[PDB]
UniProtKB/Swiss-Prot annotation:
Chain coiled-coil ranges: none
Subcellular location(s) of the protein: Nucleus; Chromosome
Protein name: Histone H1.1
Residues of the full protein shown: 41 to 118 of 215
UniProt source species: Homo sapiens
Domain H15, chain residue ranges per copy: 1-72
Sites of Phosphoserine modification: 4, 67
Subunit details: Interacts with DFFB.
Function per UniProt: Histone H1 protein binds to linker DNA between nucleosomes forming the macromolecular structure known as the chromatin fiber. Histones H1 are necessary for the condensation of nucleosome chains into higher-order structured fibers. Also acts as a regulator of individual gene transcription through chromatin remodeling, nucleosome spacing and DNA methylation.
Record-stated family: Belongs to the histone H1/H5 family.
Positions where Citrulline occurs in the chain: 17
Length: 78
DNA sequence: TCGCGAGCCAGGCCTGAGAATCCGGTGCCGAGGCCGCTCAATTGGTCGTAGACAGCTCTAGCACCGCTTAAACGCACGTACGCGCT
């Protein structure tokens, strides 16, 4: 499972009203068997790529350190 | 979700450059020794008194008891602040 796929799965899995933060996504990936320490840069890059592609809409914070949600709209505007 | 192309990061390899450090020799001036003296440390004596010892008086420091209740305590719960990470 690619980093972005696990990120999307965890984000759709969590039911936070305000979104899933960097710490929350790290905890989810760590619970998913992912090394959150050795691959931190990759997690951040995947998050940024998902934000840029419009897959994840950032709700709080700026950059990688904020919180993000699934965009249920861009999934059908391909 | 897989095949596969190619690029990015982790770490090892290896060397260069710069600096620390050991090795050698020269010289140079301050440490150690010696001589002269002189003054201060020693000895002996006297003498007066500072304090060591013995004794008594009597304060207060210790030990004990009981009653009261102020406070220490253990528990449970909540949150806000320290810590980690970016």
């Amino acid at each position: 499972p690619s980093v972005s796929e696990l990120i999307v799965q965890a984000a759709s899995s969590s039911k936070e009203r305000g979104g899933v933060s960097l710490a929350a996504l790290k905890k989810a990936l760590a619970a998913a068997g992912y090394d959150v320490e050795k691959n931190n840069s990759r997690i951040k890059l995947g998050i940024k790529s998902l934000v840029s592609k419009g897959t994840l809409v950032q709700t709080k914070g700026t950059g990688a350190s904020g919180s993000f949600k699934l965009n249920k709209k861009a999934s059908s505007v391909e």
